[PDB]
Every structure is written in C-alpha cells, then in structure tokens.
Amino acid sequence: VPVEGVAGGGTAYGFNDAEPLKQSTDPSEVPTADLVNVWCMPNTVNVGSQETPRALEPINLLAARNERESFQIAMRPKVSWAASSPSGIVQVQCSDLCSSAGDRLVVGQSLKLRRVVPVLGVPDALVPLDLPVSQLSLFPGETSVIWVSIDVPTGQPPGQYEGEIIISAMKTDVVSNLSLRIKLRLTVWEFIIPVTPSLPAVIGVSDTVIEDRFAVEHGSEDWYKKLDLHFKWLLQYRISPYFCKWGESMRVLTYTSPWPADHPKSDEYLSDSRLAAYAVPYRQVIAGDDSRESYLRKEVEILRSKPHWNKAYFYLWDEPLNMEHFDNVRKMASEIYAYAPDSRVLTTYYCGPGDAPLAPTPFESFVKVPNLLRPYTQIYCTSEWVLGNREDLVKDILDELQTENGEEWWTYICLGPSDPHPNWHLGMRGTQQRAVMWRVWKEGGTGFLYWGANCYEKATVPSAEVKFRRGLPPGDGVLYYPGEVFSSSSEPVASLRLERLLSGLQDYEYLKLYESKYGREEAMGLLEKTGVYTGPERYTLEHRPIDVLRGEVYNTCRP
Ligand SMILES: CC1=N[C@@H]2[C@@H](O)[C@H](O)[C@@H](CO)O[C@@H]2S1
C-alpha cells in the first residue's frame, strides 16, 4: 500500500480490502457467510461487543457423563441485509447430536442455547433462546454472542457424537444452500463425574430478597413454591444451597429445607444425590407454639434417624469478631450436641477476637481460633483474603487442626480477595473466575462456602432493575438474576460466573480422578506444568492449557 493509499484514498487506505463484498445484500440470493462473520470462541472468554472476527473452524469438544460442556458463537454483521432496520435478523437452528451406534443428545434436554447479555457493560447474563429454532437481531458494529451448553446424562453411552447449528440470514424452513453450517463434534468418554459432588460447595440464598422482590409473605403457600423453584434450579450447578436470614450481630438462620423434618418434602430435598450438604436451622423457620429449645430437640431427633444425616451441618454465626460471639457459638453448639453429639457445626471467620487477641499479631491470633472453640466447631471455614498470596501459610492453619478427629478446613471468598486474584466480581476475566476452584483444589480444603447468590439491593417487583449493594464490588454476592428481568419466564438466569463455578467444579473432579490414579504430587504437577494454575496471582490467561489438562486426564485415566 503506497503513502497516498490505493487509488489515492490517503494514508493506510487499502491495508486488506479483506475480500471484496458481493454487491447484492439480498439474503435470498447471497450466502449468509458473505453477509455476517460467524466464528466460535472458548467458554473462558468474556466476548465483548468489539471482539474481532476470526475464521470459522469446526468445534471439537470433550465431556464425561454427568458433565456440562460449553462453547460460544460470535456473529458480527458485514453489511445491512435489512436496509431498513440494520443490520438484519438471523435464524438459528440446532440439531440433535448422534453417534455411529445411533445414540442421541437431544435439543432441549441435553443441548441448550442462551444469549450473552452485558450487565454494567460486562458480558454476564445468559438468557434462553427458543428451541430448536430462534431468531436474533444483529446491530451494526457489534459482536453478538450465544452460549451453547451440552449436558451429558449420567447414563449416556460413550462415543463420538456429531451435529450442526445452522445460521440463516432472513428477510423482514428458511434453510438453504445459502445457510451457514457449524460443525459440532463431541467425544463422550468413560468417566462419570460423581452424582454427589466430591466437594461440598454451600451457597447462600437470601430469603428476604425473595420475600421483597417476588412479594411473597414468609411462611405462605406461594413462598414455599418460590424457594422450591430456586432450590431445584440451583442443584444443577454442583452446589448445596441454603436459605439465609441475618440476625442481631450477624447470627444467621440458615436452612436448606423450609419444610419441617416431618414432611415428605424434607426427605425429597435432603436425600437427593445431587445435594452434598444441608443446613439445619437452630430456630424455627415459620413461627410456632413451641420454644426454640423444644423445636430443635424434635427436629434433630427425626433427622439423625435418616440415612442422610451425615450431610447435615449447622451454620450459626457469620464472622464472630469478638469474644462474646465466640462464646455464643460454644453455648449454642453444646445446646445441639446434647440432642446429637455427632452434629457438625460450621463457623466462618477471618479473625480471632478483636478485644482479646489470642496472640501478639492478627494472623497468629486468627491461626489460634480452633484452640479457642475446640470441640464446639467441626468445620473451620476461613476467608481466603487473609492469606494474601502466601499459599505456604496454609500449613500454619492446618497445624492447629485435628483431621483425625473429624475437624475439617474449608474456605470462602467475598469482597476479597481482589485483582488479580480469583473471584467472581463483575469485570474479572473467565479464567480468573474458573480459577477460584483450581486454587481450592490445590490448597486442599475439604469444602467451600459462598455467602450469597441473589444478594441484590432491595426491590419489590420481579422485573425491577437489578441494582447492586453500596460498598461491595458489583457481582460480590450475586451469581444469578431473576428470569423476569430478561424475559417473562420465572426460571432464574445464570451468570457467566455461575457457569465458571460449575466448570471449575468439573475440573476439581478431573483433578481428583488423576490424583486417585497417580497420587497428590503427580496431580499438583499436572496443574502447574500445563500452565493452568501456578499461584493466586499466576494462572492461565488462555483456554488451551485447560484442554491440555482435561485431555491428559482422558488419555491417562480410562479403564
Ligand atoms: C462468610 C462471609 N461473611 C461476610 C458477609 O456477611 C458479607 O456480606 C460478605 C461481603 O463480601 O463478606 C463476608 S463472606
């Protein structure tokens, strides 16, 4: 290209004409591909509206049984093919996928499509499209994206499955030689991801938020319907929900099942294979004629008789700060041990007592907390922020614990840690979201807690603007959104962060498989040598290393 440009257009005119466009913009005579750039992107990219076209290649995926695997489709108009509201509408159709043997993953149950919609200008909300045929408006100068997810049943036969997604520019069956065909190929392999998550990831759900936003009075018939809707939707993400009301001095009432332990709904919840752990409330959920002491005796007496009691825990206090709080936990714990001594009590903390340090510094007072509470807490759930990027001081935490007697170390994340550490704050990248669980795996805790998934600011209408709480990083405490904000459906809308939480929990399961066949040192070394995760401030920034790791697990760990 000369200094004056091609044909005298001036500076830099003509650096790639980029294939002349065809001169017709008529979708009934021009191939879609000549009207719209379409390509695929990995599930770990947050695909912004200014992402540049790449060349469409076929997509080759891997998934175990009982695994969701995902990818994305990007679309950006080259021209108007609807002169009159640009750029134009496309139709999207997906097929079933089918193996040689003639086994199927069906559109609708396995295979789903969602649009990726920005929240505060960041890609985050996954809104459903009609199946098997949908339509999407494309605007000029904007990349528009679709999240394709495939859920493989636990019973699904292994094999190479294959299919197609068809994109057709429309004028305003539409399929023709003019349509663009995306070729999908998925290998289903022999691993079954455990039906019961190997890591209990307990996730709070605020009942106040539901009461105010969906306008349902606590205790009512309609309230039970809304918590049921939530509880069932959330199980698909390999988490163990609990509802949560906060109390005087950050006591918490926490409860997985709003049903009395008597009801047949209680056992329908609590012995679900998908549910790894459940909160049992200390006080009555619904008001009663009984005293709390009276109710608790009766509830524990039932529950301990059931085959699911091993999944029970009690979460009584959110971050005791001072001595009185630590004392309260001990009193309340022993109340409970009197009705069943094998009760597991969980306590979240980031500090020792402020007014009565247990040592000459904060971190060492923090480390001594088990000694102050033993044996009146079984699950010591600690704030990750407290460690900074010192993965070496994990041992200082574990050295005060008694694994051999049923004590466990768990972690949680919240308004900290921050960039560039793994978390689920809006603006954080996809690998940084998925790395929460790479770090949980590496550091060796036996479970995980997130304080809230629906902790919006207060609203009194289902479809109200989703606004975020003052003083917190937007996204902290919010992993999913109301259906009705984005459509007329009541079904919750997942965040990208919630999908990357699931993918990260699937990753945990691959790493546990590999560890069980080649040992701890070998699995630690896979996670690092592949480039996936080195430390809290050093993890992959790209997708390939993840494929390398999952691929190495498949090659080495089949029977
Ligand atoms: C457990 C946790 N206890 C606290 C919560 O009460 C706050 O709402 C949250 C805000 O980030 O931070 C930590 S997480």
Residue numbers in the entry: 11 to 182, 256 to 642
From the paper:
Beta-N-acetylgalactosaminidases (β-NGAs) hydrolyze the different β-GalNAc linkages of various glycans to modulate the length, combination, and abundance of glycans. Despite low sequence similarity, the crystal structures of these enzymes demonstrate that all enzymes share a prototype structure and have diversified their substrate specificities (oligosaccharide-releasing, oligosaccharide/monosaccharide-releasing, and monosaccharide-releasing) through the accumulation of mutations and insertional amino acid sequences. Among Groups 1–4 and GH123, the DE motif is located at the same position, suggesting that these enzymes adopt the substrate-assisted catalysis reported for GH123 MR-β-NGAs.
Among the enzymes identified herein, only NgaAt (Group 2) is a β-HEX that acts on β-GalNAc and β-GlcNAc [NgaAt (locus_tag = AT1G45150) is currently annotated as an α-1,6-mannosyl-glycoprotein 2-beta-N-acetylglucosaminyltransferase (EC 2.4.1.143); this annotation needs correcting based on our findings]. The active site of NgaAt in Group 2 also possesses a cleft shape, and the second β-sheet of the (β/α)8 barrel is longer than that found in the other enzymes, followed by an additional β-sheet (orange). NgaAt was inhibited by 25 nM GalNAc-thiazoline and by 25 μM GlcNAc-thiazoline (a 1000-fold higher concentration) (orange and yellow). The increased number of residues could potentially reinforce substrate recognition in Group 4 and GH123 enzymes. Additional structural analyses (comparison of crystal structure with AlphaFold2 predicted structure of NgaCa, comparison of apo1-form and apo2-form of NgaCa, and comparison of GalNAc-thiazoline-bond form and GlcNAc-thiazoline-/apo-form of NgaAt, NgaDssm, and NgaP2) data are illustrated in Supplementary Fig. 13. The structure of NgaDssm (Group 3) bore a striking resemblance to that of NgaLy and NgaP2 (Group 4) (root-mean-square distance of Cα atoms [rmsd] = 1.5–2.3 Å), while the structures of NgaLy and NgaP2 are identical (rmsd = 1.0 Å). The additional N-terminal domain consisting of ~80 amino acids, found only in Group 2 enzymes, was not modeled in the crystal structure of NgaAt owing to disorder (orange circle).
